[PDB]
């Protein structure tokens, strides 16, 4: 996260850190708890991941230093990538992780509400991007979860900022015209959380941008509301 500040423990209890154990253990991506055996994240996170056996999901983490060999994690039973996904820049950058065991909800770990089809029309004014990613292009993963409040940008405005890309309505952009606050390397897969009528909603999934926090280069997020039926298809399968 660029231009952010340290989060407080329990502030973003749906935020997870997804680690890979291959070749050595390291933070891979962010993610969000959306159900008691479900993590919503970005499809591009699994580039080169041949098995869910190398994945570890850590919930209830403020600081990466809380993670040692003896720290409890959730194993991943299955990786579900959207069928139409090719690359982050073309959209469909969405994936589900089916956990091997269920998450026990509490004040440290709980789900974020998915947006409603009725909320497709609402204007969100209190949106925050969170993660342990870099604070600039050449940096390192941050120990403490960071947060940055960023305004949503219309599709029309985001399309003029990304000449040469096709910014679809399945994408949602966020950033200040002057830049300064954004997601960066290591934040992808994590949430763009917006508070509406005192309820937090998972509006976006951190996907891509041209550099980090650059002027007139909004961060591009998977527009979660456009995938509610897809998530329900996968999580509510008979």
């Amino acid at each position: 996260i660029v231009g952010g500040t340290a989060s407080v423990r329990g502030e973003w209890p749906w935020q997870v850190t997804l680690h890979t154990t291959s070749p050595t253990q390291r933070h891979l991506c962010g993610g969000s708890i959306i159900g008691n055996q479900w993590i919503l994240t970005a499809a591009h996170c699994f580039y080169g991941v041949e098995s869910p056996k190398i994945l570890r999901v850590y919930s209830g983490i403020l600081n990466q230093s809380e993670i040692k060999e003896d720290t409890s994690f959730f194993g991943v039973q299955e990786i579900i990538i959207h069928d139409q996904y090719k690359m982050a820049e073309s959209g469909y950058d969405i994936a589900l992780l089916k956990l091997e065991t269920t998450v026990g909800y509490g004040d440290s770990q709980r789900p974020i509400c998915l947006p409603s089809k009725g909320d497709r029309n609402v204007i969100y004014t209190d949106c925050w991007v969170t993660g342990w990613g870099y604070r600039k292009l050449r940096d390192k993963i941050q120990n403490t979860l960071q947060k940055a409040k960023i305004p949503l940008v219309t599709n029309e405005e985001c399309q003029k900022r990304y000449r040469g890309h096709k910014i679809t309505h399945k994408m949602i952009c966020a950033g200040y015209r002057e830049g300064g606050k954004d997601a960066c390397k290591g934040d992808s897969g994590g949430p763009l959380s917006c508070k509406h009528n005192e309820v937090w909603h998972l509006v976006g999934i951190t996907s891509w941008g041209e550099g980090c926090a650059q002027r007139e280069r909004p961060g591009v997020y998977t527009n979660v509301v456009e995938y509610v039926d897809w998530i329900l298809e996968k999580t509510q399968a008979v």
Binding site: I34, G35, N36, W38, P111, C113, L114, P115, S116, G118, D119, V199, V228, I231, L232, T235, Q236
Partner: peptide, 5 residues
């Protein structure tokens, strides 16, 4: 939530 998992 309105949407239930």
């Amino acid at each position: 939530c309105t949407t239930k998992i």
